[PDB]
Amino acid sequence: MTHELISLPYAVDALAPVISKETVEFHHGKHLKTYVDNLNKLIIGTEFENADLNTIVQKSEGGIFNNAGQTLNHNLYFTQFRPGKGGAPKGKLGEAIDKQFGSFEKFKEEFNTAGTTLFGSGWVWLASDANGKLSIEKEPNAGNPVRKGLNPLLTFDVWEHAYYLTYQNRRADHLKDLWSIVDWDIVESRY
Amino acid sequence: MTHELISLPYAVDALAPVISKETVEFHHGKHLKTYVDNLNKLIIGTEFENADLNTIVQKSEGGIFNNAGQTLNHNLYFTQFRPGKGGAPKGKLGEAIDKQFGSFEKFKEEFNTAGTTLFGSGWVWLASDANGKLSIEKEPNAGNPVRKGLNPLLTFDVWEHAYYLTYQNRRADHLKDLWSIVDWDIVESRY
Ligand SMILES: [Mn+2]
Ligand SMILES: [Mn+2]
């Protein structure tokens, strides 16, 4: 199979200033393209030749896993954002967040803290199990909740390339701004 | 024990375009300052409290190690560069490199590759053991050779903050460009 560089569901400048047009150009256009290209090369001659991305992330290791995990993480990351959105979650997800974290505000506080305290490169993930129980997962480097059987709902990329051009070392400030571009309709759909 | 922010032996714009003025300001002025302040705040209460940098690094763990290792990594990193240096190593080191890697060009190729293939944040290190044996070590996140009892000679920081402002995703190009600002006279002295 040939894994693809996903086409974005919005214009490249649609998430500015939180994820600037320049950041989308390098993050999506260069980093993700590299992950996809490396993944396509590394799976040739392995048991993942004809596997779907999800299967490769659940089973692979080493370099293959690093590129697979990164491809999946970015695919979910870019597709969960939209301009003119943000706001608070609703429906079952909104109620699940309220019941399990107390309030949306408290949830954001814990999520931001998990993202800020993750040392080095990685991802902070909001994930659910088969019963709807939510958890905040800290995933170093290429980690993804799917490697644990969990459902990936919302992720903040804390690899420095996700925010350095606009925020430099201010990771916390970037995380606080990400909430403004989250499309909760999309996250809710994953739940 | 409570350390400080080392002084740069050159002007902040002296390494352009390899390490830009803004990068030095953020890398040295913000990132390293934070590692230093965090280290000072963490010595209190433990055993490594009162211990010189090298010892803290080889003896500490968790957050204390994370900040001591990064402080030591950066101190060695910033001081090994100089505008107008570069070139090739001489003396015992230059000979050790040819004998152990074949040639300086080959060593650089190996070094560059180790840096480019280190997944996530980290450091590529040229280290020496007690018998003078040289090795290229990939140190993820805050790793440093001093932790294995080795002599840290030369390091390229591959945390993205070290190059993103100028090179964005082009890590490989950044590593190729770093050779022009390495002060082999300083590296030799550590060997
Ligand atoms: Mn990313
Ligand atoms: Mn650094």
PDB file of C-alpha atoms in Angstrom, chain A residues 23 26-27 30-31 33-35 66-67 70 119-121 141-142 159-162 164-165 167-169 171, chain B residues 23 26-27 30-31 34-35 66-67 70 119-121 141-142 159-162 164-165 167-171:
ATOM      1  CA  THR A  23       4.124  26.328  10.363  1.00  0.00           C
ATOM      2  CA  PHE A  26       6.745  22.932   7.221  1.00  0.00           C
ATOM      3  CA  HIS A  27       4.794  20.804   9.709  1.00  0.00           C
ATOM      4  CA  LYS A  30       7.696  18.763   5.092  1.00  0.00           C
ATOM      5  CA  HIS A  31       7.637  16.833   8.383  1.00  0.00           C
ATOM      6  CA  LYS A  33       5.632  14.195   4.070  1.00  0.00           C
ATOM      7  CA  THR A  34       8.956  12.849   5.411  1.00  0.00           C
ATOM      8  CA  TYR A  35       7.182  10.521   7.866  1.00  0.00           C
ATOM      9  CA  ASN A  66       8.358   5.727  14.676  1.00  0.00           C
ATOM     10  CA  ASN A  67       7.164   6.689  11.219  1.00  0.00           C
ATOM     11  CA  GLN A  70       4.027   9.891  13.581  1.00  0.00           C
ATOM     12  CA  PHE A 119      10.059  16.100  28.697  1.00  0.00           C
ATOM     13  CA  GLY A 120      11.450  16.187  25.187  1.00  0.00           C
ATOM     14  CA  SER A 121       9.413  15.365  22.081  1.00  0.00           C
ATOM     15  CA  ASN A 141       8.180  10.670  20.667  1.00  0.00           C
ATOM     16  CA  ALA A 142       5.881   8.701  18.343  1.00  0.00           C
ATOM     17  CA  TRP A 159       7.397  18.211  19.376  1.00  0.00           C
ATOM     18  CA  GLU A 160       9.029  21.650  19.217  1.00  0.00           C
ATOM     19  CA  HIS A 161       8.521  21.900  15.457  1.00  0.00           C
ATOM     20  CA  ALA A 162       4.768  22.203  16.137  1.00  0.00           C
ATOM     21  CA  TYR A 164       8.682  26.918  17.665  1.00  0.00           C
ATOM     22  CA  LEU A 165       8.304  29.286  14.726  1.00  0.00           C
ATOM     23  CA  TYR A 167       6.063  30.498  20.237  1.00  0.00           C
ATOM     24  CA  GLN A 168       9.691  29.460  20.507  1.00  0.00           C
ATOM     25  CA  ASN A 169      10.167  28.081  24.045  1.00  0.00           C
ATOM     26  CA  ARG A 171       5.114  25.629  24.938  1.00  0.00           C
TER      27      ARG A 171
ATOM     28  CA  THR B  23      18.527  31.081  18.270  1.00  0.00           C
ATOM     29  CA  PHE B  26      16.438  31.719  22.914  1.00  0.00           C
ATOM     30  CA  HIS B  27      18.664  28.648  23.174  1.00  0.00           C
ATOM     31  CA  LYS B  30      15.843  31.020  27.696  1.00  0.00           C
ATOM     32  CA  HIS B  31      16.245  27.269  27.328  1.00  0.00           C
ATOM     33  CA  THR B  34      15.457  27.389  32.513  1.00  0.00           C
ATOM     34  CA  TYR B  35      17.557  24.253  32.852  1.00  0.00           C
ATOM     35  CA  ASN B  66      17.198  15.883  33.237  1.00  0.00           C
ATOM     36  CA  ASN B  67      18.182  19.404  34.186  1.00  0.00           C
ATOM     37  CA  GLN B  70      20.907  19.424  29.853  1.00  0.00           C
ATOM     38  CA  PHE B 119      14.645   9.960  16.660  1.00  0.00           C
ATOM     39  CA  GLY B 120      13.120  12.797  18.639  1.00  0.00           C
ATOM     40  CA  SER B 121      15.088  15.126  20.885  1.00  0.00           C
ATOM     41  CA  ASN B 141      16.656  13.756  25.523  1.00  0.00           C
ATOM     42  CA  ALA B 142      19.069  14.774  28.323  1.00  0.00           C
ATOM     43  CA  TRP B 159      16.591  19.036  20.000  1.00  0.00           C
ATOM     44  CA  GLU B 160      14.621  21.002  17.397  1.00  0.00           C
ATOM     45  CA  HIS B 161      14.988  24.303  19.275  1.00  0.00           C
ATOM     46  CA  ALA B 162      18.688  24.186  18.397  1.00  0.00           C
ATOM     47  CA  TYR B 164      14.349  25.263  13.890  1.00  0.00           C
ATOM     48  CA  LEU B 165      14.338  29.035  13.507  1.00  0.00           C
ATOM     49  CA  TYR B 167      16.637  25.296   9.304  1.00  0.00           C
ATOM     50  CA  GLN B 168      13.073  24.232  10.173  1.00  0.00           C
ATOM     51  CA  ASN B 169      12.970  20.494   9.279  1.00  0.00           C
ATOM     52  CA  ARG B 170      16.399  20.457   7.611  1.00  0.00           C
ATOM     53  CA  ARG B 171      18.267  18.817  10.504  1.00  0.00           C
TER      54      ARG B 171
END
